[PDB]
Amino acid sequence: LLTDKFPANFTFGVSTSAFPTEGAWDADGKGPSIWDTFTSDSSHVTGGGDAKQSADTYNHVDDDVTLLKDLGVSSYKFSISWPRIFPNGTKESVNQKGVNFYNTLIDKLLANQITPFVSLYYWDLPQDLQDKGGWSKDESVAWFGDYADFCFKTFGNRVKRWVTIDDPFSVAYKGHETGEQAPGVKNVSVTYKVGHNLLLAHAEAYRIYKDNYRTVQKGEVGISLSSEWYVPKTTGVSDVMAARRAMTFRLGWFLEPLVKGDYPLLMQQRVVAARGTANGLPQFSAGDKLKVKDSYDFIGLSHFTSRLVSEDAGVCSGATVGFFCDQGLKMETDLSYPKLEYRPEVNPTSERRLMGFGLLELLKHVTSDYNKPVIYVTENGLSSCGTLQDQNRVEYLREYSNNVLAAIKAGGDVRGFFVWSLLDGFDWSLGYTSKSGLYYVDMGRGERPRFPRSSATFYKKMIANNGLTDELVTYRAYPADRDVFLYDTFPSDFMFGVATSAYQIEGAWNLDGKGPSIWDTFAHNNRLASGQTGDVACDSYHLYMEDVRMLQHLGVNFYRFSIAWSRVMADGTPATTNQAGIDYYNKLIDALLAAGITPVVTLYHWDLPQALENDGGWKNDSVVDQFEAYARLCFEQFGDRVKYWITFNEAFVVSWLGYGIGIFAPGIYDPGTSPYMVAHNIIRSHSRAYHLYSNNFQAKYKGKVGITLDIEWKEPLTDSSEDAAAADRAMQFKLGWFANAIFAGSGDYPQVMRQLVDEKSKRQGLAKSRLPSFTQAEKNLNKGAYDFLALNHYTTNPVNNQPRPNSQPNYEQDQNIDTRYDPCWPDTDASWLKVNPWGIRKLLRWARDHYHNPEIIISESGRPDGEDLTDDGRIYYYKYYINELLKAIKLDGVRVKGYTAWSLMDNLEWTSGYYAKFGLYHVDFNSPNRTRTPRTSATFYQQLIKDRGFPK
Ligand SMILES: *[C@@H]1O[C@H](CO[C@@H]2O[C@@H](C)[C@@H](O)[C@@H](O)[C@@H]2O)[C@@H](O[C@@H]2O[C@H](CO)[C@@H](O[C@@H]3O[C@H](CO)[C@@H](O)[C@H](O)[C@@H]3O)[C@H](O)[C@H]2NC(C)=O)[C@H](O[C@@H]2O[C@@H](C)[C@@H](O)[C@@H](O)[C@@H]2O)[C@H]1NC(C)=O
Numbered sequence: 001l002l003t004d005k006f007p008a009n010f011t012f013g014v015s016t017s018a019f020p021t022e023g024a025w026d027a028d029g030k031g032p033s034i035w036d037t038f039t040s041d042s043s044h045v046t047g048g049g050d051a052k053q054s055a056d057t058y059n060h061v062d063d064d065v066t067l068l069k070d071l072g073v074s075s076y077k078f079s080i081s082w083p084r085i086f087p088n089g090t091k092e093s094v095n096q097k098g099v100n101f102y103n104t105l106i107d108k109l110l111a112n113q114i115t116p117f118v119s120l121y122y123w124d125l126p127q128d129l130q131d132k133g134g135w136s137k138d139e140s141v142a143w144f145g146d147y148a149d150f151c152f153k154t155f156g157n158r159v160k161r162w163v164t165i166d167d168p169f170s171v172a173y174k175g176h177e178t179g180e181q182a183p184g185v186k187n188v189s190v191t192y193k194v195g196h197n198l199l200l201a202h203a204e205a206y207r208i209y210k211d212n213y214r215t216v217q218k219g220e221v222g223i224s225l226s227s228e229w230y231v232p233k234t235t236g237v238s239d240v241m242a243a244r245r246a247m248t249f250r251l252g253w254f255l256e257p258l259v260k261g262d263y264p265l266l267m268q269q270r271v272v273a274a275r276g277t278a279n280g281l282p283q284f285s286a287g288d289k290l291k292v293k294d295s296y297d298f299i300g301l302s303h304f305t306s307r308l309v310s311e312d313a314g315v316c317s318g319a320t321v322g323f324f325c326d327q328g329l330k331m332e333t334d335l336s337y338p339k340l341e342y343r344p345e346v347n348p349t350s351e352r353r354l355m356g357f358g359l360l361e362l363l364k365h366v367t368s369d370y371n372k373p374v375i376y377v378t379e380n381g382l383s384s385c386g387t388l389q390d391q392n393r394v395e396y397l398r399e400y401s402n403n404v405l406a407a408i409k410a411g412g413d414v415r416g417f418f419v420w421s422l423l424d425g426f427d428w429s430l431g432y433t434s435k436s437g438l439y440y441v442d443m444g445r446g447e448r449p450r451f452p453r454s455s456a457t458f459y460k461k462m463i464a465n466n467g468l469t470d471e472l473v474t475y476r477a478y479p480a481d482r483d484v485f486l487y488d489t490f491p492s493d494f495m496f497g498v499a500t501s502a503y504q505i506e507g508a509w510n511l512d513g514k515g516p517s518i519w520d521t522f523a524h525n526n527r528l529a530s531g532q533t534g535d536v537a538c539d540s541y542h543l544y545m546e547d548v549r550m551l552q553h554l555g556v557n558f559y560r561f562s563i564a565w566s567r568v569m570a571d572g573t574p575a576t577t578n579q580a581g582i583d584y585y586n587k588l589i590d591a592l593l594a595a596g597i598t599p600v601v602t603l604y605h606w607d608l609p610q611a612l613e614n615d616g617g618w619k620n621d622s623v624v625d626q627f628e629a630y631a632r633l634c635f636e637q638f639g640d641r642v643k644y645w646i647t648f649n650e651a652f653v654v655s656w657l658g659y660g661i662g663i664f665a666p667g668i669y670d671p672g673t674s675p676y677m678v679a680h681n682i683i684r685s686h687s688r689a690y691h692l693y694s695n696n697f698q699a700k701y702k703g704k705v706g707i708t709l710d711i712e713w714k715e716p717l718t719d720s721s722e723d724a725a726a727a728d729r730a731m732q733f734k735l736g737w738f739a740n741a742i743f744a745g746s747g748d749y750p751q752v753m754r755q756l757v758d759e760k761s762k763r764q765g766l767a768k769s770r771l772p773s774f775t776q777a778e779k780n781l782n783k784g785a786y787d788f789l790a791l792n793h794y795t796t797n798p799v800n801n802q803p804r805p806n807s808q809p810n811y812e813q814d815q816n817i818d819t820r821y822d823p824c825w826p827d828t829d830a831s832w833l834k835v836n837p838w839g840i841r842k843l844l845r846w847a848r849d850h851y852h853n854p855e856i857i858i859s860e861s862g863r864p865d866g867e868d869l870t871d872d873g874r875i876y877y878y879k880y881y882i883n884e885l886l887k888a889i890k891l892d893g894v895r896v897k898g899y900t901a902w903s904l905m906d907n908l909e910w911t912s913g914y915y916a917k918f919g920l921y922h923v924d925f926n927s928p929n930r931t932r933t934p935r936t937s938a939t940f941y942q943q944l945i946k947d948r949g950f951p952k
Pocket residue numbers: 087088090092093094
């Protein structure tokens with residue numbers, strides 16, 4: 001990479017085109033384009049969807065010009081929509097409201113010192129003109145002339161850089177031969193006639209400008225052409241001339257008519273050789289050659305890729321005519337150059353390659369063979385799945401703009417570089433499956449908010465320094481080791497397990513004297529899917545012996561399950577101790593130990609006995625004593641054989657879902673106060689349960705007590721310091737809510753929660769703050785009240801700052817945050833779970849740094865899949881999350897002592913019923929015997945334990 005400065009009056013720009021970004025497809029009298037009609041057929045668009053709104057730039061001029069001021073670009077390339085100016089294509093349809101929109105944009109651009117670089121035709125052909133033949137017709141030269149003449153006299157007093165036609169190759173070939181772009185015509189005999197008329201339309205536009213508008217307006221008029229760079233597959237003369245021939249058919253098809261005055265002679269000969277003399281390229285009239293030759297002030301170039309070309313006379317057969325059968329060559333991807341996908345294993349055959357040298361050679365070729373024209377790179381950029389930490393785009397922007405510097409030093413007269421693109425949009429036939437903006441656009445929000453990707457920060461800094469600096473040479477958007485797969489084994493101490501839950505597997509909700517749960521009541525109130533209940537579930541009350549055999553087949557070291565409070569105490573009181581309940585858990589513990597499997601017992605999970613919810617449940621404050629007496633009964637009966645206790649599972653869910661929005665049991669909706677009241681007692685219940693164990697049981701039993709908290713990793717949406725503070729704030733409010741008082745050291749809530757809920761409570765007119773206050777004695781009982789930390793981790797979220805100065809009392813509104821999902825993270829059967837393996841690694845270091853380097857167990861990890869036995873999604877998930885877990889141990893030193901896979905078998909997924917299959921075993925819930933069937937994932941997990949990591 002060169003650290004030289006760009007020339008003095010070099011233009012750093014950025015590009016959009018009307019249809020991918022404007023939206024408002026029929027607002028204010030705009031007529032339909034061929035792309036409106038084309039995209040109305042889902043089969044034409046990858047991933048479906050339409051551009052009826054897309055990025056909605058028609059309604060964001062003020063916001064988008066502010067983004068242009070933030071980058072510091074000198075100029076802005078955009079497109080005028082023909083059907084928005086002339087709804088039916090003719091000058092009689094002139095729509096003043098469409099004229100007003102572009103005037104607003106041009107005026108606002110110049111008020112902020114940004115040069116307009118205006119394109120007249122970026123494929124937006126009005127549907128009415130297509131209905132009468134489109135570009136195949138000789139009338140299209142006149143249609144375009146009247147339309148160009150209008151924009152010249154209407155905007156030309158301010159617009160000084162014009163592009164007649166953008167990428168005629170795609171308009172002709174992709175739009176009329178293969179049909180992949182609008183208007184979807186598939187006719188090999190139309191393409192050369194369309195390119196012919198595009199060149200004639202551009203010439204008529206250039207002629208109109210030179211004679212009627214140039215003397216007064218003093219602007220420039222050019223055309224923009226697209227070209228890949230073609231490197232020969234071998235050094236043989238055959239392939240070197242096949243590569244040069246592909247450059248001729250793709251770029252010289254239009255460049256040679258405008259420079260030399262005719263189609264390239266090589267191109268003329270090849271088509272007549274493959275099609276017949278009656279079917280050659282169109283002939284230019286003597287007057288046509290006069291109008292076309294030298295009809296440019298600059299040449300625009302859009303470049304993206306380099307491909308390998310080799311001679312292939314039999315690339316087609318049986319006289320199958322066509323644009324690429326006339327050339328007699330094949331194109332391949334150069335897999336020798338870095339792949340630009342989200343992760344190393346994504347799409348091995350990818351064409352997105354880091355080949356900046358191709359742009360250097362393209363520019364030098366255009367300078368050498370076409371008499372050194374003025375060049376603007378009007379479009380150059382990388383297509384992504386959409387991530388905002390776009391190291392791939394940063395590398396692309398860094399390398400490719402650096403090869404522009406090399407062309408200028410090699411004599412290339414390149415005066416501008418325009419990045420494709422400014423925002424995300426509807427990338428033609430790729431639809432929304434392809435993102436390219438320096439700014440991400442959230443297409444799930446009506447206002448379509450814009451957010452800078454890391455490439456926006458890079459481009460801003462490079463323009464500020466007029467080239468690269470040492471900081472920009474080595475700049476990275478994320479650490480270089482993030483996606484590297486680590487082949488290694490786990491430490492000797494490391495345990496593998498799987499987990500279940502009492503209400504989700506056991507059944508027998510009222511057999512043998514068991515009292516009812518708040519989840520028995522939730523289910524019997526038809527609050528679960530299809531009125532499905534956990535009345536039988538997997539019948540683990542009767543079939544626990546099957547569970548042990550499955551655990552033996554997996555080879556797990558430990559098995560984490562939960563005790564049902566209502567099964568050992570009918571009403572949650574020792575007065576209702578159910579010896580039958582004691583015996584059931586004694587049988588499960590003994591069968592696990594006889595099989596050499598370590599039992600791990602969760603005390604609570606989520607099934608409070610209804611008798612205690614009647615007295616106020618977790619809001620009642622004596623629940624601290626009630627939970628302590630329940631913990632005592634468990635420590636006495638089972639403490640002799642159970643050596644790892646977990647007090648609570650996902651106290652966040654019990655607090656916010658159960659007592660906040662009331663979607664889980666007990667179903668109380670009070671999002672302002674009760675979640676904090678319940679979490680307060682949970683912290684106080686866990687602390688008293690821990691001290692009861694260390695004071696009265698740890699000496700003789702030598703066990704460890706922990707707590708399990710669920711948490712998504714919280715990644716900043718943007719590299720800004722306000723978004724980094726927002727991400728940490730989202731961590732504190734969900735994980736720190738409980739972990740801070742137990743693990744951080746102060747025995748108290750995170751300072752951010754106390755500051756924020758107090759201040760908002762005061763504005764809302766509340767006598768006391770909605771977040772309770774610990775007594776100094778209570779804080780001291782919280783301090784160090786643990787032996788290990790346990791984390792449930794499934795997914796992550798990008799977070800951004802979002803002040804809410806008028807928010808109502810609400811645990812989520814108190815946080816001043818907003819959440820999204822990275823578009824690159826794959827989906828699962830659950831709308832809230834996205835696959836992001838490195839989230840568990842960043843989460844583990846966060847817990848390590850904030851909680852005094854504790855012993856950590858991952859108590860839950862997994863995803864839903866389909867019902868068939870081949871769950872490749874589950875395997876992909878475990879393969880890479882466990883590898884990221886291994887990285888947190890070996891590479892990061894985090895004291896991770898165990899890993900728990902959710903779940904052992906299909907079970908009742910709370911409100912989602914049995915429709916969400918989470919298990920390594922399939923469970924037939926229509927069988928009375930509830931047969932369990934191992935999936936592919938069970939073998940993969942069993943094999944991974946044997947290997948103790950990842951070998952080779
Ligand atoms: C292209 O649009 C022009 C503007 O018309 C407006 O947009 C079109 C898409 C349509 O929605 C119209 O309703 C809009 O007004 C067309 O010109 C217009 O043509 C119409 C007739 O088609 C004409 O209406 C007539 O006006 C006379 C009085 O002058 C009245 O007695 C009639 O009853 C009827 O109302 C408009 O006045 C006229 N406007 C302008 C500015 O020209 C254009 O149509 C073509 O050109 C006009 C001059 C006539 O010769 C039409 O026969 C002819 O088709 C549209 N062109 C095409 C190819 O569709």
